[PDB]
Design a protein around this ligand. Structure first.
Ligand SMILES: OC[C@H]1O[C@@](CO)(O[C@H]2O[C@H](CO)[C@@H](O)[C@H](O)[C@H]2O)[C@@H](O)[C@@H]1O
Ligand SMILES: OC[C@H]1O[C@@](CO)(O[C@H]2O[C@H](CO)[C@@H](O)[C@H](O)[C@H]2O)[C@@H](O)[C@@H]1O
Ligand SMILES: OC[C@H]1O[C@@](CO)(O[C@H]2O[C@H](CO)[C@@H](O)[C@H](O)[C@H]2O)[C@@H](O)[C@@H]1O
Ligand SMILES: O=N[O-]
Ligand SMILES: O=N[O-]
Ligand SMILES: O=N[O-]
Ligand SMILES: [Cu+2]
Ligand SMILES: [Cu+2]
Ligand SMILES: [Cu+2]
Ligand SMILES: [Cu+2]
Ligand SMILES: [Cu+2]
Ligand SMILES: [Cu+2]
Lengths: 334, 334, 334
């Protein structure tokens, strides 16, 4: 019925994003994506705490999918027989059938193919949502990512000027609920099913044990710091499928920010901290002015420093003494 | 002194809203409303947990009051002798005297009549606020609702175009604090006064036991699902008098959203999830494009699925395969 | 190198703000400020609970610094030898070096001088951030304040009209974490270092024991109520360095509100409640229309009434019966 050109995308693991055009002369296409569910025990902190994760494509978050307004997104969702539970997918970008969830419930050993038209621009969450109490559990176990639906003319500032990024990163924040035993040590479990009772009891108390970017404390640090150069315009897409977050670039700003994440609305300018509503993605762009280390955090600083929610940028370039200078180094008080 | 026409309104129980005009050729009127306080033990979940509720007009939330900018709202507040506590009313829409609270404190057996001019457009909370520690307790016991103050020309998109809804629903979200005994079972109490000590101790820890729409788990489901048809523009007014919420229509969008709830500001467009600040009401409109079941949730999914904060819409009409289609049903992996 | 005129500012304790111009014919200057760190045990509630505070200039919050866009802000930070810990300062308004923190780490007995150019307009947090787990601890111990960077033409409504305030107040909200002993009584400690272990364990659970304005329950009440007169336009700057807040003026409104706090964006109009993201400052202006007592709260009413987060305004002037009137005083029900 639908006779449009087909284009396959090779998804890449976060925080990177598959290659795409911003402004495009292409017309609508059917863009084809594949997600393969993986349930797996992973390590989430530098002390070796383990977690029963459930993921799209083996990562937390799931990969960022990028399309343009009016494209048709055709996803093959695969639930291999090596998994234990049914799963599905719900796209906040899509219209009808609970975002697709009512059409994609698959048991281990099955796959399904869903197509939806990208009628709404912005960044959007996608997540598993099998039904009932399983919905929060699968999401907070890691089964969420995001999609970005660009205008065909690319981004603008609302005020007819184009806003072109040099690079884009996707920072998926995950609230995790790991129960503790009587000693006060984090518990380990042999299966997601076995983790369920204790994990649900903790979840209902609403306080996470960990809040992490890219699946683990320190994931986006050291060798895996985010990078930029002075003069580069970087777009940071930030999602949180269950709980609020308040992103902040320490030493920088959000030059243009869509905190509700939707490109039909003009961005706000010159923010210090912005707010990602639980169940949403937002986006912020910043042109780096200074070299050095920056930290990208949620600005609940307890969560950032003590629960895991800190990434770093390492930025190359020349220091600008007009913008900031140490007039007098630390010295004894006169 | 004030010589304007008087109009009586028959309030209706949420989620329905009393009949009103959007755009009107009427001039200012004195619009007359009556609220009768009822303290009552109610059931809040499908397991039979009870709660000592305090309500305006017998409902949680209290009913939605609808007027137009420049009307005078004249409320008779009635506290029958069958109640145990003093009560009052504070309207966020009103100016002076703590929103009216300083002029409406009434003991059991008394009534009072307050008039305020509707100078600010939008949706606003109203709530009881007797003084001191009683303020949070009365609010989280159920004593809150909302008022909607429409422009006389009706709603607009900010961009000179009219925005007319086919129907309006009021979803009042309530955070409830029910203490547990040593066993781990929810406690029942013989009076609001007897529930006070244990309830205050829990309240100060800031974690609700239940988060519900329209007073109970499952209230807006089954026979009491919200309804629409494909092609209908529905306005959903959402209030939360004490705690933040993040509304989301699963399978839909907020086509036009006033998340801070005030019609002097243009709506945002094409949202996935929006944010209702504790102590406020907001409003979102959506034109349904697909038939079927939708869930309307706060997108803290633990609260939605496990604590009570899910409503359903049942929508009639024709499925649109252009917008979404199951290209291949669940099948064994090749 | 930088040859501009120098101007010294005498900082004043919150909620007051040092004298400044709104619109100015001055060009860029180097504006000189001094902050002296003080670690001190203070009383935070009317029951006599004590707290190991860490402050800029002896106050919580630290004082508001006011400059204009394109000024250079030169701060001398002083850490006297009477303190026990290293400290630094990070300005969200500044660009590079973690907001200045990477250039201002000072041991007891040292001082440092930092200059930054005020390229971004709005209200911004400043806070200490020494590194690692110390970052949240120093902030929630009191080491935060705000700076306001005004346009040189003063404030505007976005719609070419000027917005001039008659007075400005700075309300700094502090979430505090005071542990309890087995009895259930709040603990007292002999030093910040001794309070650290118990305080960090509580902090990671994310629930404060107290939420206060200006450092203490009841600080901005009685003799220290905020004041205004009918007809006065008051700007209220509100900051929260770690945790969200939802300000509300009971009996009033936010006539013009920058809830993300940045003057490059037009204000929203006619709000009931606004939202300050943890790690940010915002600002709201209101022209008083009625005399009497107003309460300024966070509209989590449990926090406001039970945890400490209430200020009062006492307003002088003539009551306006058109806006609100008690039509019939409390009487027996007919
Ligand atoms: O940035 C979106 C914002 O900008 C405005 C102009 O104020 O419209 C621009 O963006 C639209 C969506 O990309 C374009 O269709 C339009 O042509 C362009 O002017 C606003 O209408 C919009 O909210
Ligand atoms: O939607 C409100 C938003 O729209 C604007 C136009 O951009 O003004 C419209 O709405 C006002 C309030 O209803 C009307 O008085 C006005 O005539 C109309 O253009 C904005 O000014 C406003 O913020
Ligand atoms: O209030 C800021 C908001 O107003 C606009 C006009 O809609 O610009 C005004 O404010 C700018 C910043 O102060 C001035 O430079 C400009 O000249 C003035 O019109 C918007 O552009 C801005 O977002
Ligand atoms: O599953 N580990 O690559
Ligand atoms: O009070 N029950 O209808
Ligand atoms: O330290 N007291 O003024
Ligand atoms: Cu799943
Ligand atoms: Cu969802
Ligand atoms: Cu009451
Ligand atoms: Cu209120
Ligand atoms: Cu410090
Ligand atoms: Cu900071």
């Amino acid at each position: 019925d639908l006779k449009l050109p087909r284009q396959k995308v090779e998804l890449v693991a976060p925080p990177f994003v598959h290659a795409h055009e911003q402004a495009t002369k292409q017309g609508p296409k059917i863009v084809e994506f594949k997600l393969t569910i993986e349930e797996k025990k992973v390590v989430i902190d530098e002390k070796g705490t383990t977690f029963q994760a459930m993921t799209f494509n083996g990562s937390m978050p799931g990969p960022l999918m990028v399309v343009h307004e009016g494209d048709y997104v055709e996803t093959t969702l695969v639930n291999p027989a090596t998994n234990t539970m049914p799963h599905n997918i719900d796209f906040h970008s899509a219209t009808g059938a609970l975002g697709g969830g009512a059409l994609t419930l698959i048991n281990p050993g099955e796959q399904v193919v869903l197509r939806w038209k990208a009628t709404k621009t912005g960044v959007f969450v996608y997540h598993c949502a099998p039904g009932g109490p399983m919905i929060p559990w699968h999401v907070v176990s890691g089964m969420n990512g995001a999609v970005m639906v660009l205008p065909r003319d690319g981004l603008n500032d609302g005020k007819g000027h184009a806003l072109k990024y040099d690079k884009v990163y996707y920072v998926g924040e995950q609230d995790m609920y790991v129960p503790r035993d009587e000693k006060g040590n984090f518990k380990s479990y042999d299966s997601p099913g076995e983790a369920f009772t204790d994990t649900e009891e903790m979840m209902k108390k609403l306080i996470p044990s960990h809040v992490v970017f890219n699946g683990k404390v320190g994931a986006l640090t050291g060798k895996n710091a985010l990078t930029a150069n002075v003069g580069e315009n970087v777009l940071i897409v930030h999602s949180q499928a269950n709980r609020d977050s308040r992103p902040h670039l320490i030493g920088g700003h959000g030059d243009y920010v869509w905190e509700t994440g939707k490109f039909g609305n003009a961005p706000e300018v010159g923010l210090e901290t912005w707010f990602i509503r639980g169940g949403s993605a937002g986006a912020a762009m910043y042109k780096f002015m200074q070299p050095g280390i920056y930290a990208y955090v949620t600005h609940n600083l307890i969560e950032a420093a003590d629960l895991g929610a800190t990434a770093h940028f390492k930025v190359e370039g020349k220091w600008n003494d007009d913008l900031m200078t140490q007039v007098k180094a630390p010295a004894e008080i006169p």
